[PDB]
Amino acid sequence: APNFSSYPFTLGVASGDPLSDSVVLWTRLAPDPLNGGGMPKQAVPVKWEVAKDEHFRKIVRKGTEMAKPSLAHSVHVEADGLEPNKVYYYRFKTGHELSPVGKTKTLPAPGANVPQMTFAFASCQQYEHGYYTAYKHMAKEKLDLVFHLGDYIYEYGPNEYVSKTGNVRTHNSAEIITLQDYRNRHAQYRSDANLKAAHAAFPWVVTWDDHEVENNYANKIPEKGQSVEAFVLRRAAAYQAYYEHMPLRISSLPNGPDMQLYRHFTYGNLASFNVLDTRQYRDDQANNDGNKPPSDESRNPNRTLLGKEQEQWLFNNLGSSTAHWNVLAQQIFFAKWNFGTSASPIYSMDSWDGYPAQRERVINFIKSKNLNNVVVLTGDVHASWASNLHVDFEKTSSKIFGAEFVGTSITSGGNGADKRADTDQILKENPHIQFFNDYRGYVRCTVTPHQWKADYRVMPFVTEPGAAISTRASFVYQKDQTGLRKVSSTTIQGGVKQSDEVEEDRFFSHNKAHEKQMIKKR
Ligand SMILES: [Ca+2]
Ligand SMILES: [Ca+2]
Ligand SMILES: [Fe+3]
Ligand code: NA
Ligand code: NA
Ligand code: NA
């Protein structure tokens, strides 16, 4: 009989990591969410129900979990005994308090011959840079699931990482360090009504990038020559807070600074999804990070992004898959992405171009199995791109093994534009690249056995609430040497047409943030 002085489900509900017979259900009791949750230091019973209908007359599964202080009174339920490829509704009750109703959906039975799948993927939602209008629109989509590919939170204090179009909202605290700091930052982001609606609408498959801990971290090495010892404690705090706020299974429970997040599942026989973790195990960025010429350092063949175990696990999944599609749901730019010239190349040291030997091992394995059904989903870069993936990244004449869809950010970077100052140059230098756009939004994918379609769903602005969404462009890939085909293209009403931004602005703006952090320590 817990009683509350304020409505406890301030962060809503969520579901995730669906399998054919179960799904994770999530909530958190947080009546005062930005001040640590406002809960007493005792375990609180939370009842849960799963039904076939939204009025809960046809309940199929129910139980009681004990929400505990040591996990910020979060609740993770693995609701099993469910049927495959079926929509369910779920809700929680604590004392007399009722959560919002959530909607979810189990996967098809393994090997089921499913004709179609629709999903969206998102990344990069800097709270200060704009409103979450993208998620208002996403919540109205008809999707089987959603992927989040990282930067679900950012770690900064206020007035540090400042958008070109202004910081319209403000982080709740100084730069986040402790478990409580991370919990409160997750609560700030998750309090947004639009994000909560998108969570209540679909099951999510999440994976993190850098800003869930700190900018451009690499395994246990923080950026800018900061302390490794302090960073390891910080990673443990960040990983715990992430678990507490995400609909993950119990095998993802962290143990100190370590946490199993990479994982695999198949959507019938249509698509095999490898959800990667390119932060937790990676070697340090070469050449002091940033955008630099390649070097013996960056080209060192021992350097890894995935780590040895994840690499082998991935090869095992790719080699044994009989699905129509093999998908890498991951964080960072995979295709060749030269910012310089052929003679004097310049590459992102934090992207796959910074880890070329690791990329070679993945491509060589894909070549060895003769695959041409590989799709890579990406975030991080705060703009939309699409590329044909060739078995030799230097030869457009080489065989196309797949495609990469790089999604823009939900908000990071501000209102943006259709085109930037360096767009024509980069496209010229990188002819495998078929698309650039710099408006905020997300990517919607529709998959059938012989065709993959990606729609880029974008808005003219995020600095004010209420922008309309449109499909800027749509591409289809059909597993042949013609690669990506543009099937739609529309100009965005009310959007800036061309800015003077260049890719280096993202690195520069993150470095200005760090400088401001240092100045604040006087
Ligand atoms: Ca970064
Ligand atoms: Ca990132
Ligand atoms: Fe980001
Ligand atoms: Na580094
Ligand atoms: Na080495
Ligand atoms: Na920092």
Numbering used by the authors: 1 to 522
From the paper:
This enzyme is a phosphodiesterase but also has significant phosphomonoesterase activity. The physiological role of PhoD is proposed to be the release of phosphate from cell wall teichoic acids under conditions of phosphate starvation.
The structure of PhoD was determined to a resolution of 2 Å via a multi-wavelength anomalous diffraction experiment using the iron cofactor as the source of the anomalous signal. The core of the PhoD structure is a sandwich of two long β-sheets flanked by α-helices of varying lengths. Three active site metal ions are coordinated by residues on loops on one face of the β-sandwich and are covered by a long C-terminal helix. With the knowledge that PhoD contains Fe3+ and Ca2+ ions (above) anomalous Fourier maps at three wavelengths allowed the assignment of the three active site metal ions as one Fe3+ ion and two Ca2+ ions, which we label CaA and CaB. At the Fe3+ site the sole difference in amino acid ligand sets between PhoD and the PAPs is a cysteine-for-aspartate substitution in PhoD (Cys-180). The CaB ion has regular octahedral ligation with Asp and Asn ligands. The C-terminal region of the B. subtilis PhoD protein forms an α-helix (residues 560–577), which lies over the active site. The C-terminal helix blocks access to the catalytic site.
